[model samples]
Target: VSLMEKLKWKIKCIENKFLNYRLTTNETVVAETEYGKVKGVKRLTVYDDSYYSFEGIPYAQPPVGELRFKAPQRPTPWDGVRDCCNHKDKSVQVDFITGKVCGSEDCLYLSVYTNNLNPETKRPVLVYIHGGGFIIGENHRDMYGPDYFIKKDVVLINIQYRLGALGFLSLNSEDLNVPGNAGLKDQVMALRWIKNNCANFGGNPDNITVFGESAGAASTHYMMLTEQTRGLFHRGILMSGNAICPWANTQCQHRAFTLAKLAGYKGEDNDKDVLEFLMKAKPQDLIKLEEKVLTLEERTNKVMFPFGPTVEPYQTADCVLPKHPREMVKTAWGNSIPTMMGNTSYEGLFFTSILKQMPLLVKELETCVNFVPSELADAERTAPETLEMGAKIKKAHVTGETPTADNFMDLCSHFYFWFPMHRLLQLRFNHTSGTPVYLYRFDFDSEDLINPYRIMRSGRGVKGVSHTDELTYFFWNQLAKRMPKESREYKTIERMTGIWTQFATTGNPYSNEIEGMENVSWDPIEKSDEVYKCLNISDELKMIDVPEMGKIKQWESMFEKHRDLF
Candidate 1:
């Protein structure tokens, strides 16, 4: 190495000494926020990079007792230097795997991880939202540490927000009574808190990137459309989900009333009556009651659940979601934000992961006509047009001559997960007022990923990327142990983490941030194109124009005819 090169490298190491903190122990670190001082502990990652982690820091007053069903209030100020070392309880929510009530309503906390806690350097920030279908999930620290991004000089934050009925269900009111999107508002509050206090923790508030998977990704998409989130975050990455996904949003006012009645409530006219009923019921029991509503909605409407963001009463001041998901994005507020969103190759397997029967049967497909399209949630029972649409979908996606699990699962994956996502991207890119939007497809899966693949019981020997499979590459998945350096998946993880955080640093995903492919270039989607282009994140790591153009056009034609059932 030349003398000047040696001198420059040493200077770089001195500025980032925090990444080498493992040389010492019992390192008690303290940082000040606007509210109070917080004490954290320094730890080393699997890669041997030292970083500081402050867990269980409350960002808002617990949404318990009187605060239930209302907008989140700012966190109460504390006097002493609070010890934020231990993990905190998550928001009240049901278990996605097991039908259990696993979290608490006293859970509006966030955690931060950074290589350095110095205020001088403006490190980029990446805030991750957890995914559980807007129903079940939490911001637990053990699972989501800053192992990958912290090495790239970025601060990582995991935030917890309201979930399920308490978070999204609404009675369609004009006033604050039954105001919808409490969960989104909770996230907004957390982002605002970080924006104000991140500077104290070596983070750049101005250059914040919000990213999430599934429902969390959906939340990131919705945040871009919301008025309150205008200046809070500058970049977004949505994985395996987005706002236009058939399951993301719903008009479930009827289900909200049904749940209320099931919980022993009467008097449907007043929204206050519904609130009183939910307030009296235990959080666990409320979820249990909601379980019935979910099953019924699934059977009747083919929707994921009858609880999510809703169009509130018109012109209400606290109206978070005043219009449908499609309508909101066309406005100036939603079109301006820079975003990157994509789905796995075989995302429908996430639903297939938990099937009561092997190989989806024709009986089930024929039985539910209105269930195929999410927009058909309110369609009349057994509408002829919907049945015809379902028949064509089965004809195109399934093999009647050979009824097998593979084709059935593939059909479900494309119809439910892939089609909606691709069309939504087309809609967004077509209508946006010339904002940069990047797209990707996580097509890579390592052999070690087979362990969780079996654990999830999605299906044996299922090829291609399943939903949430992309997560293990970016975040540490204890369920699926980290890949070895020699493995192709490991290198893809390295490339993806760099591409994602690089966008967080600069508006571009391709740049000097990536190690192997520093000069690799990616272009934003043009408004209209017969074959869409995307950065295919797999072993090959190549960008290509989509080859499924014909199938997508067919789906678009069906959607056009059945517009109401969209």
Candidate 2:
């Protein structure tokens, strides 16, 4: 090699010397963690306003082998440069059509984009957690690209954690000290990685926001409860999911059992004998059985069998579960972090697809509480007895004879999402140390996306919306410009990014000093019935009062009514 080339290489090596010992971000400019470094792709941000991109940023160590069932740990480090310019292998995801699977077992990495690599004008970090209900999605799930974000001078970090059984399996203690919930553990470690290293990517480490939809949204909520994630991010965005309900508890347990049986475990995970029998199974048998379960499990039922974080006794040698998970989220501590929590108006459509195919089979009534029909809980908030309150939901799904679209939507939204979200908010308020909360509703039913997918009416225009519809206005749909009747959507993106960054930087969603539309006045959640602002994104950004949302009591009354029956 020429002297000049060698000199340049040596100079670069010298510049990386101090960062070598850093916890995150490395010499190759890779984002490094104790687990190791992830080398991501180098790309420009937001119309190429900034020149930055990352490939492999190991948020958590690959939860392979024995680490597969344990909490996330510090990843091992490498001595040389690793690439960080391309998406890493994703964990197995359900086949959108064949319902087969694509991806791998060892998947835990993150990708990042920013304007200035060594930026002096520190920007708040918006860590984008892609949505896919947990078991699917990747770091580069380009629904909302970082390119535009860079234009706003904000740093964007995309995460990829272990998914499905490969990441979330929880084998009860067997083999003396068996493994469990390695996937959830992986996500925790990833956040820790980001907390430690975001500064290197031109992000304010102290100012971090965790946001995602569905599964990713659920994880964002879960972080509030985890010991490992405490103080990791100042704020969160729950785009329409929370795992605080018992219905989820039952589903998670039963699903674990189903996988255990297939994995060659002779007994149930609940019974000591059954749990023990399966505890000592060969690893290969376990892997084979996990795949079998995934293959057999229907995609529509993925929610009932969702595989991700659970409320295990936190292992914090120093901390405890924060009140934000369920209750006490509004105390000074709870409400301290500003938030933006909302869901699409037509969230019912997703479940519409699910209920349309299933055989309404259930031995008990509560199993149908979140979806489908049967006697279930409706007022557990006031009536603790599941049997006593069973009558409330008997006629819940009975719309004349067969279920109506509205009934199905109510069943799905109330039990699984809407009510639980309200409960979470209340929980945060009551248990927390008093933190202001901001809520929103994404009500835009885009003709752009709906028309292309052929899911909308020809000329009537897409009136109502569905899950993931918010995605159209942000990145891939190129609808950042306009959302038809809703022209303000183009403006909402700027406001969203600003609030996201402002919150990340100060735990306050509003820009404190830099006033602009980014500094627009927004009301608190309690101002009206539908506390969350509804973004139409067309003629104008309308903040509507949805008093119906206050009926969360009705929904919770229904859910708590049947918490334990199933």
Candidate 3:
């Protein structure tokens, strides 16, 4: 090698040494929060940018003991400074790899990362909610590092709430009063905490933006339509999920009772009796009964998640979801807030693991009347009209050939992710209150480093970008830590982080000054546009009419035909 190249390498090594020293130093900083003072540590991002790290700070009281299935409460204040250098335990959930129970009941915590500690700085705050179908997920830096966003002038926060049965079990007992959506309530409490104390961390509480992927995305959108979150946040970024997704909300009181029975409850099938039994049962035992609670029709339609946000049977002061999402989206309060939302090119590829049971699933799809969403099918599973609707869907997507994994990808993507998002866009466009609504289709893919989701789910062979693939470009995860500075993946990371932080900073994603994104103008859907405009994100960032417009329209027509049943 030349002498100049060798000299540059030596200088980089020296710089890294200094960065490591600063990260491990004994120095700490303190920020006064509403609950108490928190001590944080100084750290460097992957790009060698220095920031403050305050982790595992409690935003709400622990949802343990009698608070298991109820709304989250405010965190009690403390006198002394609390150490927040290390991350706390995540919500109780099943380990996806080991199929074993992990985490704790006391997991209502949040972490903050920022470059400044003075309240005068007033930087934008970006709060992220991780997604695992509301069944398994946590708030940890391993997957959601602040390295990318911290490079910009934004304060980043990650939050953890309840998961599985402990988070979303619902019962209709006024006596026991086990309203569902305790997990969503945990998020609401965290938002309230952030709005109340973000200024202490050099963050502008009024400029908070909430964003998430999959179930977290759905939660973000759900928060937009609910009245409880009215003044908590000012903007939203939903990726690959929304409140209208079939799996986002459910009527799962039957599943709750089924779980009680599976956990050795043999008393009368009443709400108070069942909830009392559930409250006394072990948390791990309740989590283990998650799959056992799914009805046969739900299993046939691949609706595996048994616990999630649901409409409250009785409206109370603390109700999170008072009405059906379908009715709420038409007049959503979120339309006034500037929003950015979209999905990947091949979202259903995340379900490739289900191919192992393809033979059985295909049999059920053909013989049983469960080809559509369980919400629609459950309305009248055996009705002649339901069978006709199923046949129409099967014929439209699967064609003359028997359904296989490859052929069924489009159907799964449309029904589960794409169509619902498209419907949301149309609804928002029709009722938009002059706020810009930007849309995008994430098509960026590379062989250099497979995304964590595709890697974990054995989806490397999939031809297109699957669900959660876009996250790799926006965060510095362990899998992408060693990426070369000049590679396309690294460039994509720069583009994504630049655009996202730009939106968080100024409610607009277009910027000609961001290094890799110069000259790209992303136009939001406007009233005069003939077709819905969307930014196609790939090697070349360009505006294009929405992809597969015909298919989306077909799905819209189908839903319209069955609107009464829904």
Summed backbone clashes in each candidate are 1, 60, 0
lDDT for 152 (candidate 3): 76
Hey, what RMSD does candidate 2 come out at? 10.3
Cα deviation in Å at residue 160, candidate 3? 0.8
Residue 513, candidate 3: alpha-carbon lDDT: 70
Per-candidate TM-scores read 0.88, 0.73, 0.91
Candidate 1: lDDT over CA atoms? 0.72
Estimate, for each residue in 16-93, the C-alpha lDDT of model 2 and write its tens digit: 333222313333445554444555444432232434677656665566555554456566677766777555677766
Each prediction's Cα lDDT score?
A: 0.72, 0.54, 0.79
On TM-score, the stronger of 1 and 2 is 1
Q: Among these predicted structures, which one has the highest lDDT?
A: 3
The global Cα lDDT (0 to 1) of model 2 is 0.54
Cα lDDT of model 1 by residue, 1-566, tens digit: 23553454456445334433433347879989898999988876666677788888888888888788677889889888999766688777764334357788888899998888874679888899988788876665335656777777888999998888888777666554666777888888998999899988888888999999988888888888777777788888888777877778877776777788877887865666777778888887777777777655365565777678777655444556778887876663656668887777777666555454533443455433543565642356566776766665666555556445555666666666667777667667646667798878778876565422233444446666677777777775334345677777667778888888889988778865455564446788876666778877766667777555555665666676566434
By the lDDT metric, which is better: model 2 or model 3? 3
